[PDB]
A paper describes a structure:
In this system, thousands of copies of transmembrane (TM) chemoreceptors, the histidine autokinase CheA and adaptor protein CheW, form highly ordered structures known as chemosensory arrays, which cooperatively integrate the sensory inputs of multiple receptors to regulate the autophosphorylation activity of CheA. Core signaling units (CSU) of the chemosensory array contain six receptor dimers, organized as two trimers of dimers (TODs), a single CheA dimer and two CheW adaptor proteins. MCP molecules contain a periplasmic ligand-binding domain (LBD), TM four-helix bundle, and cytoplasmic kinase control domain. CheA functions as a homodimer in the CSU; each protomer comprises five domains (P1–P5) joined by flexible linkers.
In this study, we present the structure of the complete CSU from phage φX174 E protein lysed Escherichia coli cells, determined using cryo-electron tomography and sub-tomogram averaging to 12-Å resolution. The map of the full CSU, determined at an overall resolution of 12 Å, clearly resolves six full-length chemoreceptor dimers (red), a central CheA dimer containing distinct regions for P3–P5 (blue), four CheW monomers (orange and yellow), and the lipid bilayer headgroups (gray). In the periplasmic-focused map, the ellipsoidal shape of the individual LBDs became prominent and clearly indicated the orientation of each LBD, a feature not discernible in previous studies. Using AlphaFold2, we further predict the atomic structures of the CSU’s constituent proteins as well as key protein-protein interfaces, enabling the assembly an all-atom CSU model, which we conformationally refine using our cryo-electron tomography map. The constituent models were assembled via rigid docking using the predicted interfaces and our cryoET map to produce a preliminary model of the CSU, which was subsequently refined using molecular dynamics flexible fitting (MDFF). The resulting trajectory identified interactions between two co-planar clusters of charged residues on the Tsr LBDs, involving K99, E102, and K103 on helix 2 (cluster 1) as well as E124, K126, R127, and D130 on helix 3 (cluster 2). Rather, these interactions appear to form a pseudo-lattice by which the Tsr LBDs roughly maintain their relative orientations and inter-domain distances. The P5 regulatory domains are rotated slightly compared to the orientation required to form interface I with CheW. Intriguingly, the P1 domains were observed to form a dimer wedged between the two P4 domains where the aforementioned excess density in our cryoET map is localized. The P1 domains themselves are predicted to interact in an anti-parallel fashion mediated by P1 helices A and B, such that the substrate histidines face away from the P4 catalytic site and toward the P1/P1′ interface. The interaction between P1 and P4 is primarily mediated by a string of oppositely charged residues residing on helix D and the C-terminus of helix A in P1 and the α3 helix in P4.
Residue numbers in the entry:
A (entry chain A), D (entry chain B): 257 to 647
B (entry chain E), F (entry chain F): 15 to 157
C (entry chain D), E (entry chain C): 1 to 131
The structure:
């Protein structure tokens, strides 16, 4: 014996209806948490505290509804070994794909889209990530190669890594091919930083799209397919050791924590994942800067101040930064200040696409309604990271 | 029967739109300015938990004399792809234009273009300018 | 790594239940006074699938009970045994017991030995008297 | 070829967890929805509007989770031919089973407890009900029987009937057996009413239950399982005609529809299914009664007037019916009035069992809580039905 | 009398997705350098159900394609057939063809005749080398 | 071994109960009386979506003199299978009685039965009565 239970067949079409019903449920339920905030915690203390119970139940129910559509990842791990055992023989190699963490699960809709992304990585590890058997013996390694395919949960995200044992991706080929395209690169970058260069459009592990690495599939296409699914991608390569390629796939794509700020009768929102801390500006720290902007000394670093009122042309706002407040941000191994007028706190609301009734600008990522019924605009952090350089 | 349209006033001139595209009518309400947008767009206002942008047709036509009063009215629409409202100084009167009353647009220069105009509504001594609010709000400029 | 052995057990218990349900409906449309050749093959190939997993995971109670039915249906479709209302009633009485014995494995219990020793004789004796 | 789909294995435990999450959600929004109505509409202006959209979507997702958990009734009807076509040939009879409404569905948990009850009814029809072919032709009845197992939906319930054209349930045999055990009977009861008296302890279609029927299950045990599920049972049979047994099954047992009645400060609730009409009787429809009581004339019929303040001993209540309000109730076929002070309206409150911290008291069945916070006692209509009989 | 048989066709396609998947899992973990008789039994269970299961719903193309492969699995688990890196790869490649033939029925179409005539000659060719 | 208890006053005497059985102390407010119930029970008070019945100890114990001043406090208990509260004239002190301070109580209680007393708490010129609240709220009247 081991474990007993029961199960029944559930039509996939009916599962899609659950996501549609529970999806709008959280939206309609979110409105209850907006107007209820106007009530005071003294008199209406039980109501406010009870309102949060209805919200957390909807969130927990939404995450549970998605689990009904998930399936064991062991079924997905049955396509990569067949390709390795089949492709290794054609290329003339002996590789063994090891499977780690089989209890992991993934949404069925994502499984149908996670094959080609991951499949493109397995072909790269065997095309150049692992050298011939004769070369492995010279470097003290075993003749038979090895390939790891781990997959475990990390809170509200699904982490999947693909690590190998060979030398990994080439180093001089990436820098040599990156310099020709005009990308800011150099030899001082470490193996981890050099791995973040293949994400450019039309840039794969080789000089051109090789047939061995999938037909019409490259690293540039793998990234675009992950962004549509609300996921991310990271690489931790190392010359001589191997090449680890991590991918993230959040469970739910609706609620997003963020700091609510106000800029002269204009309540904005800033993602919390990028917010680091804040402080009171000082005249001794503010200095000029190209493009009319300014800088702020933050512990041996003059972060660029991205005045939110000049970019959007907000009238009546405190032009002097000394009277306002600055919120530090971070994204992509580099920081960048952001000048605001006032702050509020951590508010968890549902996102909305402004293109449904108008359009989206580079300075906006998603809309949402506040507690007082007013509409808010979530400021994209990916833009601020580059706007400071353009200005 | 003839085609029905909703007529409204905008200071001196008068325009009209299809009644089927109109959802409801309600007084002016507070809006929220959008970051970097034209001047003829006031903002967005909440309505049953839906973001309904508010556009001022009087400012869109680029008029010389512009006025503002507390009796402003906003006509809510329901297009086939979006739900954007329109601001009007005051509704006029619902009519049922026939095939003979709906004349083509003028040949000289006007406020909008030929594609953004359905025709001209004749009603006695009151010439109405039919505006195709559908494709107007869903044009390339608004996307 | 690989999936736990419980998945293979629960899967067979669920799949087998679906086969017994669909297979049982075949006798409904199949009138006892006019058995269609195409319908007899559907019942044979249906119970045959249950014999595979029943004999692989160690379900002797279900494998033996299913193996006997596979022999009766085999001799009835290729032209080696007659079919009448009396034999059709035995299949219905047999499939019902197979469902009870299958539920025993779901709850991790030994099927009723009295029902097994009683249904096996009805299937084996029929293979000799009908001839 | 209309359209196809697929399905994935889902554990029953995971589906059952959804009912618990959505269960508290439906119960949470119900309590919060009542508070928004009692409070002023200013702060709850848009909250009440969003509650309407959520009140419907909350049930849509609930019914969707249940529908996915149900199974077609054909799976349950596929087991009856095994007992009909087989037992008919063994005993020497001809019975043809007919299935009506196969598209109907039913909860899996309900299928694991309604097969044997229904299986016992079919077994009795093939022994005591339906006779031999010769006896049927003698009385002009067709030789071949006709057992029909109907089934269909009913809003928030499921109806299942077992119609039969057998010899029919005897009337004189039930009255003699019911009166012996001490059951109130009379000749005024029609053939359809006497059929509902076969639920006595240890009794079924025939007096010999344990001797004939192998399994120790009868009408007394069948009704017991129905009470645990929250359903009902009805029988409409007659001698020399046929037999029909209806069985209902609920879907959600967490909300009870009932009007909130007030009786001097204290507030109570009355079920809505039992309330027939209500008015303000005057001096032109009030007569005395033996024992210091009164009766209400409703279209000639003088119904008994039961004072609600006497049962609970409420001080300062409207003892006179001309000042208060009288509502006509019903429980078990017979109608009876009830005196109260002032009404409120129809409100869907959440049932709250009082046995969790004490025990049931006479005159009360359950309780709940209003928007403010006070506890509302749900009066039991079954108890009041027995008070008028003693008067 | 009986529900529409079209609902069961989609059920078999769902089971095949698990059987075909599980069939490959055992073929992958089964190293050709040191086979295991215990793993060969699970491989036969997946192919045995599809063979008897496919034919139950009238699927003739998928039945013949699975019968030829099942005959090789039966002789392998019983120690009557040799296995190497080349033979194991053929079973994995066969699972890919069986998946294409399954997709044909999922779309209410018949598999390609060219693909069927190729996989059959591949399985029959190995039978001559083993025997 | 030593055990802590919660002391409380009820008239001209002071009783005690195990601290482990107590859940939390709250303020005394109006309750919803339930007819056809014992006299020593006032009503019920919802707490966290659970009906918590309230009991008045000042009326029980064969005591006529009862008060409802501002010092009246209600104590919420938690007997696992039951969560019934109790009202007291006012929480007094808290004592960490040991094996030497907890003396066996007489067989004949002062105002309870012969099995509703755990012991007697000693404290100089203050003799506390350790009432067995576990069995007190499970007698024939509470079921």
């Amino acid at each position: 014996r081991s474990n007993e239970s029961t199960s029944i067949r559930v039509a996939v079409e009916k599962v899609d209806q659950l996501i549609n019903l529970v999806g709008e449920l959280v939206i309609t339920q979110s409105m209850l948490a907006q107007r209820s905030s106007e009530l005071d915690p003294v008199n209406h203390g039980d109501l406010i505290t009870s309102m949060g119970q209805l919200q957390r139940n909807a969130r927990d129910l939404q995450e549970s509804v998605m689990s009904i559509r998930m399936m064991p990842m062991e079924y997905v791990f049955s396509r990569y070994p067949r390709l390795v055992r089949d492709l290794a023989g054609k290329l003339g190699k002996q590789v063994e794909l090891t499977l780690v963490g089989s209890s992991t699960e993934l949404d069925k809709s994502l499984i149908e889209r996670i094959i080609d992304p991951l499949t493109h990585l397995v072909r790269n590890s065997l095309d150049h990530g692992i050298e011939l058997p004769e070369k492995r013996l010279a470097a003290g390694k075993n003749s038979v190669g090895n390939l790891i395919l781990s997959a475990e949960h990390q809170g509200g995200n699904i982490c999947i890594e693909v690590t190998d044992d060979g030398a990994g991706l080439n180093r001089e080929r990436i820098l040599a091919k990156a310099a020709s395209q005009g990308l800011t690169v150099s030899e001082n970058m470490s193996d981890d930083e050099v791995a973040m260069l293949i994400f450019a459009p039309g840039f794969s592990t080789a000089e051109q799209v090789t047939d061995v690495s999938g037909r019409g599939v490259g690293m540039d296409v793998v990234k675009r397919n992950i962004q549509k699914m609300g996921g991310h991608v990271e690489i931790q390569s190392k010359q001589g050791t191997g090449t680890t390629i991590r991918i993230l796939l959040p469970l739910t794509l609706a609620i997003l924590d963020g700091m609510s700020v106000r800029v002269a009768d204009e309540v904005f929102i800033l993602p919390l994942n990028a917010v680091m801390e804040s402080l009171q500006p000082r005249e001794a720290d503010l200095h000029p800067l190209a493009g009319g902007e300014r800088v702020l000394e933050v512990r041996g670093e003059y972060l660029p101040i991205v005045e939110l009122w000049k970019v959007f042309n907000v009238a009546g706002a405190k032009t002097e930064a000394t009277q306002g407040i600055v919120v530090i941000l971070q994204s992509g191994g580099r920081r960048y200040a952001l000048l605001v007028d006032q702050l509020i706190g951590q508010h968890q609301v549902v996102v909305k696409n402004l293109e449904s009734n108008y359009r989206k600008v580079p300075g906006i990522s998603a809309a949402t309604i506040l507690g007082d019924g007013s509409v808010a605009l979530i400021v994209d952090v990916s833009a601020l990271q580059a706007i400071n350089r353009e200005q | 029967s003839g085609q029905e349209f909703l007529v409204f006033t905008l200071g001196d001139e008068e325009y009209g739109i299809d009644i089927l595209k109109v959802q409801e009518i309600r007084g002016y309400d507070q809006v929220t300015r959008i970051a970097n947008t034209p001047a003829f767009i006031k903002g967005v206002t909440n309505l049953r938990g839906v973001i309904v942008p508010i556009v001022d047709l009087r400012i869109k036509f680029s008029q010389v004399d512009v006025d503002y009063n507390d009796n402003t009215v906003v006509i809510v629409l329901n297009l086939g792809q979006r739900v954007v409202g329109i601001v009007v100084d005051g509704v006029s009167d619902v009519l049922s234009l026939t095939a003979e009353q709906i004349r083509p647009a003028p040949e000289f220069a006007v406020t909008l273009s030929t594609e953004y105009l359905t025709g001209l509504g004749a009603l006695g001594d009151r010439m109405l300018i039919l505006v195709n609010i559908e494709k107007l709000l869903n044009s390339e400029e608004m996307a | 790594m690989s999936m736990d052995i419980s998945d293979f057990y629960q899967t067979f218990f669920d799949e087998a239940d679906e086969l017994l349900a669909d297979m049982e409906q075949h006798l409904l449309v199949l009138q006892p006074e006019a058995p269609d050749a195409e319908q007899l093959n559907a019942i044979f190939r249906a119970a045959h699938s249950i014999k595979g997993g029943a004999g692989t995971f160690g379900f002797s109670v279900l494998q033996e009970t299913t193996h006997l039915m596979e022999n009766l249906l085999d001799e009835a479709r290729r032209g080696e045994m007659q079919l009448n209302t009396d034999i059709i009633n035995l299949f219905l009485e047999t499939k019902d017991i197979m469902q009870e014995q299958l539920d025993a494995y779901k709850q991790s219990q030994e099927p009723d030995a009295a029902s097994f020793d009683y249904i096996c004789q009805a299937l084996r004796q029929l293979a000799l008297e009908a001839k």
